[PDB]
Symmetry: C3
Subunit: 54 residues, 3 copies
Amino acid sequence: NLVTAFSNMDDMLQKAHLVIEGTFIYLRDSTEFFIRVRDGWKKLQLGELIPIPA
Amino acid sequence: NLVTAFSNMDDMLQKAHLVIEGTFIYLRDSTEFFIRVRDGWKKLQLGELIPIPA
Amino acid sequence: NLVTAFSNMDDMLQKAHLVIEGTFIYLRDSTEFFIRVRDGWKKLQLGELIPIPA
């Protein structure tokens, strides 16, 4: 539907049925993103962390 | 606005006016993602399929 | 929450507190995408512009 999150990848992996296909998944611990697709997930390619200006 | 989908890329290509710029596009057949932008689309870089745990 | 936008990267960089972590950020001028994460942003890897069919 939109975007949800999990503490980490393993939490995401065990809750495949709680996420509808085509939804974005944020991993709080690693600040990474995955997408729930048919029969699994796919990792979104993200760049290096851009620190917030002072 | 958010996220929509098409069966495949060609269906997406012929419906450019049905998707507002800045929207995410899921291709059901290839489980790929595109983003509708100014004057076209851009393919989102996704990783290999991560199979669901047994 | 979902998706928002800025004219360009610099406008985005000065408004870090206007975007909640886990939100997608579209840059109108460069038609690029970033994601607001913990302590900053991360650039989404996008492909070359796919022109709209005539």
